[PDB]
């Protein structure tokens, strides 16, 4: 598909994020070539966002809710579920695949 | 000091960019961790700009002019002559040294 999760470390396996849930994550995204383009880990500023509401790239919206609380996975997002052909210039060229390490630290009030 | 050059390949050793010149070049930028953050070279869209007048980061304003027409060098630019404390979000963290591969394709009307 447009997004695929490799599971790297298992979450709790019951608590998954449904739509409109307020997700809290740490991540690091690279390009296929290996360049780190953004990392909430490096900034020690854990990213919070609402989920099924399209405030983040489709690959994220669609891919995160399949992680349970505490899970550590990797998201592979095709340009089509990413920043499209346009991209996010200097950082993310157009038609860029994305590889995010992702850690789910909380769903709404949960941690 | 602030920017350091490393001539990789010699230009014509006659034609140097003086201030207020319009330069044409082909560049690749990387963080100290090997991550490429921008590259006219990959876009195949050679960047053009005026040099002494602060329409690029200072590291360039002061490096590019040390190069002659045709030269390939490597600029090393401290955060201080770069993006400084703020950096450039997503791609370029705060307080980041930069390493630009640079090719001086043209000075005003020369190639």
Author numbering:
A (entry chain B), B (entry chain A): 1 to 111
What does the paper say about this structure?
The 12-kDa FK506-binding protein (FKBP12) is a ubiquitously expressed peptidyl-prolyl isomerase with considerable homology between fungal pathogens and is thus a prime candidate for future targeting efforts to generate a panfungal strategy. PPIase proteins all catalyze the cis/trans isomerization of peptide bonds N terminal to proline residues in polypeptide chains. In addition to its role as a PPIase, FKBP12 is a member of the immunophilin family and is the target of the immunosuppressive drugs FK506 and rapamycin. Three extended loops, which have been called the 40s loop (between β2 and β3), the 50s loop (between β3′ and α1), and the 80s loop (between β4 and β5), surround a deep active-site pocket that binds both FK506 and rapamycin.
Thus, to assess if this interaction occurs in solution, we made a single cysteine mutation, V91C, in the A. fumigatus protein to try to capture a disulfide cross-linked complex. This residue was chosen for mutation because the structure revealed that the V91 and V91′ (where the prime indicates the other subunit of the dimer) side chains are within <4.0 Å of each other and that when they are mutated to cysteines in silico they could form a disulfide bond in the intermolecular dimer. When the proteins were purified from both strains in the absence of a reducing agent and subjected to nonreducing SDS-PAGE, the samples revealed the presence of two species, which were consistent with FKBP12 monomers and dimers. When a reducing agent (β-mercaptoethanol) was added, the proteins ran as monomers. We next separated the V91C dimer from the monomer via size exclusion chromatography and crystallized and solved the structure of the dimer to 3.2 Å resolution. The structure revealed a disulfide cross-linked dimer. Interestingly, although revealing the same general dimer that we observed in the A. fumigatus and C. albicans apo FKBP12 structures, in the FKBP12(V91C) structure, Pro90 is slightly shifted from the active site and adopts a twisted conformation, suggesting that the structure may have captured an intermediate state of catalysis. In fact, the conformation of the Pro90 residues in the structure is closer to the trans than the cis state and overlays of the trans state of the protein to form an all-trans dimer revealed a clash. This finding suggests the intriguing possibility that part of the mechanism of prolyl isomerization by FKBPs is dictated by the conformation of the substrate during catalysis.
